[PDB]
Amino acid sequence: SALTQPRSVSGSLGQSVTISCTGISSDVGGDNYVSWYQQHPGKAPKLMIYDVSKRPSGVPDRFSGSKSGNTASLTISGLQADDEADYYCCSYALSRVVFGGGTMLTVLGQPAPSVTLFPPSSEELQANKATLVCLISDFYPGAVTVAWKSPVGVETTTPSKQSNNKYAASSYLSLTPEQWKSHYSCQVTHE
Amino acid sequence: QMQLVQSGAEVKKPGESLKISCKGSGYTFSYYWIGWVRQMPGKGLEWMGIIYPGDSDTRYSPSFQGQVTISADKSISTAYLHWSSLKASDTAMYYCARQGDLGDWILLGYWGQGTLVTVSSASTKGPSVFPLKSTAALGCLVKDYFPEPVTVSWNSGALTSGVHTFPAVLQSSGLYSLSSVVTVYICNVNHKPSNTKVDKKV
Amino acid sequence: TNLCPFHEVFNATTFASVYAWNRKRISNCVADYSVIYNFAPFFAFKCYGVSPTKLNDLCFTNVYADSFVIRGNEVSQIAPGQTGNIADYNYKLPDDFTGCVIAWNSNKLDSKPSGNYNYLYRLFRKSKLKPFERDISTEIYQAGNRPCNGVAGPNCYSPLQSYGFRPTYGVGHQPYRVVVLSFELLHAPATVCGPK
Numbered sequence: 001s002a003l004t005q006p007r008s009v010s011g012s013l014g015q016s017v018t019i020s021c022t023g024i025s026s027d028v029g030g031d032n033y034v035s036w037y038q039q040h041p042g043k044a045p046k047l048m049i050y051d052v053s054k055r056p057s058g059v060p061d062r063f064s065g066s067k068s069g070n071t072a073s074l075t076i077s078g079l080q081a082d083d084e085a086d087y088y089c090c091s092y093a094l095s096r097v098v099f100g101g102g103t104m105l106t107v108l109g110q111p112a113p114s115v116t117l118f119p120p121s122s123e124e125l126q127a128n129k130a131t132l133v134c135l136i137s138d139f140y141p142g143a144v145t146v147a148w149k150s151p152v153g154v155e156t157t158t159p160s161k162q163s164n165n166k167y168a169a170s171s172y173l174s175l176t177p178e179q180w181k182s183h184y185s186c187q188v189t190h191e
Numbered sequence: 192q193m194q195l196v197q198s199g200a201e202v203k204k205p206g207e208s209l210k211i212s213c214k215g216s217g218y219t220f221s222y223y224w225i226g227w228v229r230q231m232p233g234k235g236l237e238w239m240g241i242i243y244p245g246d247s248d249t250r251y252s253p254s255f256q257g258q259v260t261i262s263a264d265k266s267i268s269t270a271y272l273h274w275s276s277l278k279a280s281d282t283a284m285y286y287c288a289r290q291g292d293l294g295d296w297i298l299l300g301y302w303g304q305g306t307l308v309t310v311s312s313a314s315t316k317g318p319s320v321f322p323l324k325s326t327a328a329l330g331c332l333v334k335d336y337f338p339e340p341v342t343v344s345w346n347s348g349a350l351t352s353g354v355h356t357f358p359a360v361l362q363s364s365g366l367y368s369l370s371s372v373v374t375v376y377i378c379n380v381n382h383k384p385s386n387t388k389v390d391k392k393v
Numbered sequence: 394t395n396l397c398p399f400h401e402v403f404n405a406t407t408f409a410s411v412y413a414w415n416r417k418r419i420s421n422c423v424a425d426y427s428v429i430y431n432f433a434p435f436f437a438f439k440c441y442g443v444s445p446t447k448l449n450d451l452c453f454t455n456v457y458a459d460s461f462v463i464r465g466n467e468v469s470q471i472a473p474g475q476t477g478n479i480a481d482y483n484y485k486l487p488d489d490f491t492g493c494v495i496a497w498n499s500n501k502l503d504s505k506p507s508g509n510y511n512y513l514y515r516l517f518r519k520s521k522l523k524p525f526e527r528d529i530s531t532e533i534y535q536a537g538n539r540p541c542n543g544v545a546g547p548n549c550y551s552p553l554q555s556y557g558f559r560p561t562y563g564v565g566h567q568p569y570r571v572v573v574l575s576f577e578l579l580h581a582p583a584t585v586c587g588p589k
Contacts, residue, residue: 026401027404027405027406028401028402028405028415028460029405029406029408029409029415029460030406030407030409033407044286044302044303044305045228045236045302046302047291047302050293050300051294056293057293088235092298093401093405093406094401094405095250095297096238096253096404097238097297097299098238099238100235116325116328118323118330118370121321121332123322124321124332127319131321131332131334131368133332133370135370137355153362155361155363157358157359159358160357160358161358163355168355168357168358169357170357170358170360170369172360172362219506222504222505222506222560223506245501245560248501292505292507295406296406296501296505
């Protein structure tokens with residue numbers, strides 16, 4: 001069998017959330033072969049629930065679970081910013097472990113973006129290049145819009161490492177030195 | 192203490208047949224199962240197999256019955272992944288796991304750091320560094336590098352406060368680009384996939 | 394027809410305690426026992442009334458797979474006419490048993506280096522179990538004449554003990570899984586057969 005997991009889920013701080021895991025198997029010897037794993041961006045999985053009627057050591061007591069037929073559930077009694085990570089359920093009843101598709105929990109909490117423009121250096125000009133780097137950080141929402149100033153080779157990434165629960169982004173305007181010296185204002189819009 | 196470290200990043204081309212390793216310590220590497228888990232970019236985890244270091248009893252998943260073989264050297268407490276005729280689809284962060292004293296023999300209790308395996312042919316190019324009313328924040332601009340596992344530091348690690356390394360940007364040219372700013376200095380770039388280490392000051 | 398659920402009984406992750414041996418109703422299938430021969434080097438495959446080789450060329454009315462993990466020094470007790478703690482108080486097969494006993498080592502699966510206490514065995518009971526009987530109770534056994542209650546005492550002890558299987562223990566003390574396939578072949582209708 002294969003486990004299905006709602007790709008995305010949401011919640012609010014202080015409240016609770018539930019995750020569904022359908023496709024649990026069963027064997028002669030037990031039917032509670034369900035476990036849940038947490039994985040932050042850029043880190044390894046961390047077991048949080050095994051033997052759903054039990055919890056590991058060191059895991060907060062707010063991570064409790066319930067079973068309901070071929071489906072299991074995970075309840076986070078109190079959402080916090082440190083819970084914004086993917087959750088994968090596992091079924092290891094038939095000596096073969098099967099993982100789900102993951103559930104990205106996006107907790108809603110306190111929300112402005114800080115922009116800093118860095119002009120190209122002299123080494124870039126000597127190398128026959130000109131790159132204008134535009135930085136964005138200090139914004140909580142996972143969405144930000146960027147523009148360039150006439151209305152404008154530039155790329156940018158929306159997501160970023162949430163070290164202090166604050167998103168970030170950076171843009172790199174790639175242009176030739178002649179086009180850069182012939183003439184800028186990194187325009188950034190946010191909710 | 193119980194530790195489980197994996198080999199470093201391995202940038203390889205199709206058909207080089209590399210091998211990843213996992214060095215275990217802090218426990219008896221003879222009675223606890225040891226396996227590997229695959230996680231492709233953006234997708235979820237995938238189980239490959241487990242091995243009992245005591246006897247050569249390997250249990251593989253139906254999807255990895257012959258694509259890769261798991262081995263363990265009980266004399267040095269290490270497990271290995273042996274790839275033969277790698278493919279571009281093998282690009283993924285492979286995580287090692289072990290039994291644990293909590294649950295059943297198959298339950299993965301403790302996990303490792305994970306080794307990044309990149310099967311590509313983008314010339315394995317090295318990065319180029321350029322030192323960047325503001326007075327402020329200083330930084331160093333890095334560009335022209337396909338391998339993602341790049342690290343940037345300042346003063347060999349002496350400056351950490353105010354330092355923030357932001358994600359990279361994979362331009363249409365197939366090369367990444369990132370930046371690092373320090374709130375207020377020599378910036379150190381270490382491109383391990385190419386052994387290209389460079390030091391620059393703003 | 395549909396294949397037989399020989400999986401979930403052999404390829405299962407954990408089996409059950411001896412005092413809670415599970416039975417899986419196997420009916421309306423094509424029993425291909427060839428998948429068991431190449432499963433593992435079993436320590437015992439004693440079939441009573443039938444030969445292991447000449448087993449895929451017959452039919453059975455209703456076969457029941459009894460799964461339970463026992464200790465090595467007491468695998469000789471899972472057989473007809475045997476006596477002992479597990480034979481008399483946990484799991485007793487009849488003298489007229491017609492089936493196969495499949496036992497193999499499980500130290501690599503059912504034995505942690507800190508003690509697998511999830512496997513329990515009934516040590517004390519006021520009467521011996523009859524063939525194909527189960528006692529999941531957990532009432533304190535009164536050995537003496539003094540009354541007892543829901544709490545242990547000097548003369549009334551707990552009925553279930555734990556086999557602390559560890560990988561360091563020698564043969565005999567290691568865990569050994571058991572699958573007792575009970576056959577019943579007669580003029581009755583056939584629900585499970587072999588691959589023709």
